[PDB]
Design a protein around this ligand. Structure first.
Ligand SMILES: [K+]
Ligand SMILES: [K+]
Lengths: 420, 420
């Protein structure tokens, strides 16, 4: 297996339309969570979300028009646009714009989404009913298929390597990165764009998650306090939106061209709960196996771990994951920092695992553990540092990131500082 | 990398609710294509589809009730039910029902869909608009997520290994099998259920694919003749439905327990066109790269190839693939049989690549190449044997199968008779 490194980062998040402003604001303790004003939510029990700040592109805002022409945007659901934007960033960051046949052929794209084009499907359904089939757009299908994020990105940049997509709810972005890394390690590609995208902030999605009682409902008038992983007063997740893309690259390829390497991906672990369609396993056994698998692949002892980015969605399951991590770490619990950045940007669903992978990379770069916001009163005492309220500056060389998706689909990633 | 074999087959198709009856009718030259009677299609340009024969389970019919309780079926879109049924078959065929922790943990599931729960999303949309958010089902989300196929199957059978899912339109089922095989080869699992499922026969999907003029329209009065890959009079694909699942197993694990081995998976190739959102590369270069990649991985020379299962959807693109195959085969073109079974069962979308893999396996078992039905007047002459009208009995030890999906996502698989 060839070694795989990370050479570019792209992010459109509820904190900012780019990577560096997202990170800056994350570390400053800012929240992306607010009352929804874009559409009617007066009849919903959840009236808040973590939303991308829209604008002209200055001061960390996001301008869709800079990434895709207006008229083109109208042919696709937003998840595709977000993916294009994050990719634009990533490629630029990696300084990788393949032109030659050789370069284009060895560069692939693997972008997933949990839900994809749900909004567009509903709107087309209304057209069909109200206006009939002759009014359905020729672009209905492509603008709605999950794999068309990979497709659109591939077309824009002439990326002719493996073109692939995954869908695993909350663990989508993590699977994307792990799978893409394996394609490189196995020799199917030398460079991959990888990550996740989601645009679930719409009435149908909000009603849907409210219906299975998954969302926070008691803090519609105090949005910045709603997302509170580990806190005794948590009451469900806050839905977010965005896209997170990394450029993965074979080590010698990167070295040869003088690329700046952020970190190395060294471990990937997968498991299944086989328990329940939406509830996580009460035993945390699946989570534990995911982590152990990732660590074993990475040949990393828990004695070497510095920071864990939790799944930690602000649901009752928070403490199941906590207990599992305690079991994994054993004696080393007091020396590992673990936090949930969902406390700041909500739950990005399909993009979550990728955004968090990004945060992990930057934790290494800047030797700082992001905070768990709002952690006023932990449900249970633990020896693990959950980094309440404010980030912690500390040595971070080796990191583990967890993603535990609906359906009982678990993924864990291990990354480490690149020395050589 | 450990070797990976196929030890179980499961299939719910437009010819039959099981594998053996599907294969039997396929070889008899039967078509699963008929006028749609279940819902109104009078206002649609395409009024035909390849539909699963529903019944009490006898004489090759499909009874959903035997696979999932009625009350449970009402909570999910049909793609999930098909998957369950196919999985039920495959595990039975493999005689693999893990009960120990060890056996459960080493058995995973990787089932994809191209489109998933589109019908249910549209229906929930109508509810949302007409009755309001309060009336949305608590089961809306889980019953609609693509990955919940893997989820439901995992839960039913206590499969606690990697639980994963992919989405790549027409190449979904191929990616699933190739990806699942790699998980085994890499030690992440010892057994995997893998494949694809789709339930796209509904008004929204039909209107959608009609809108981008992907579907056959001129033979609504002669359905069994509509799907005619390579024929001068072809005019688009015929939408099908169903699920196809294989049990993949590490070689030594299979041998130790005395499992019957159908074939070995030895190659998997991936590429991207980077051309167009729905149309294939005019040059076929992507297709060509996918095939070559699979063959190289398999360490198979084209001189050893016996049978090719084409993507061949009955669209103008049929001859692009044909040309690409000719370039790959070169001098050996006359030695190889190639057919499209979409001529018989239509385009299963997410399930196509897995259904076709199954047909490959059986082509090996029975030394027989399925026909390309309806091939009266080929658009172009070729040295390749396109097996028109009736199947051809011949030596079949090494097989290649192609899947080329919307978005420019290509997959090829290479399988071979197992000797040792
Ligand atoms: K995480
Ligand atoms: K095929």
């Amino acid at each position: 297996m060839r070694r795989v490194v990370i050479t570019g980062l792209g992010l459109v998040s509820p904190l900012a339309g780019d990577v560096e402003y997202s990170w800056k604001r994350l570390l400053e303790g800012k929240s992306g969570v607010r009352r929804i004003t874009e559409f009617d939510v007066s009849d919903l029990s959840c009236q808040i979300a973590a939303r991308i700040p829209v604008g002209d592109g200055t001061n960390g805002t996001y301008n869709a028009d800079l990434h895709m022409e207006s008229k083109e945007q109208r042919k696709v659901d937003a998840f595709i646009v977000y993916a294009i934007a994050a990719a634009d960033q990533a490629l630029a960051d990696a300084e990788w714009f393949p032109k030659s046949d050789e370069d284009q052929i060895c560069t692939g794209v693997l972008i997933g989404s949990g839900i994809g084009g749900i909004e567009g499907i509903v709107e087309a359904g209304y057209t069909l009913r109200d206006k009939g089939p002759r009014r359905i757009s020729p672009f209905f299908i492509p603008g709605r298929l999950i794999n068309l994020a990979s497709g659109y990105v591939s077309i824009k940049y002439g990326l002719r390597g493996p073109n692939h997509s995954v869908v695993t709810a909350c663990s989508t972005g993590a699977h994307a990165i792990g799978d893409a890394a394996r394609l490189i390690a196995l020799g199917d590609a030398d460079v991959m764009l990888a990550g996740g995208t989601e645009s679930p902030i719409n009435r149908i999605s909000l009603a849907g998650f409210s219906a299975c009682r998954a969302l926070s409902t008691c803090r519609n008038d105090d949005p910045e306090r709603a997302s509170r992983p580990y806190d005794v007063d948590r009451d469900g997740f806050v839905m977010g939106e965005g896209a997170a893309i990394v450029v993965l690259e074979e080590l010698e390829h990167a070295k040869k061209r003088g690329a700046r390497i952020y970190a190395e991906i060294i471990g990937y672990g997968l498991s299944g709960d086989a328990y329940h369609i939406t509830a996580p396993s009460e035993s945390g056994e699946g989570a534990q196996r995911s982590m152990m698998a990732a660590l074993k692949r990475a040949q990393v002892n828990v004695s070497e771990l510095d920071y864990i980015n939790a799944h930690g969605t602000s649901t009752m399951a928070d403490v199941i994951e906590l207990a599992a991590v305690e079991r994994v770490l054993g004696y080393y619990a007091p020396q590992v920092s673990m936090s949930s950045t969902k406390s700041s940007i909500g739950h990005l669903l399909g993009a979550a695992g990728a955004a968090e992978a990004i945060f992990c990379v930057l934790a290494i770069r800047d030797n700082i553990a992001p905070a768990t916001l709002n952690l006023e009163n932990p449900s249970i005492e633990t020896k693990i540092d959950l980094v309440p309220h404010k980030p912690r500056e500390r040595k971070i060389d080796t990191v583990l990131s967890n993603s535990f998706g609906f359906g009982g689909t678990n993924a864990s990633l291990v990354m480490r500082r690149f020395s050589e």
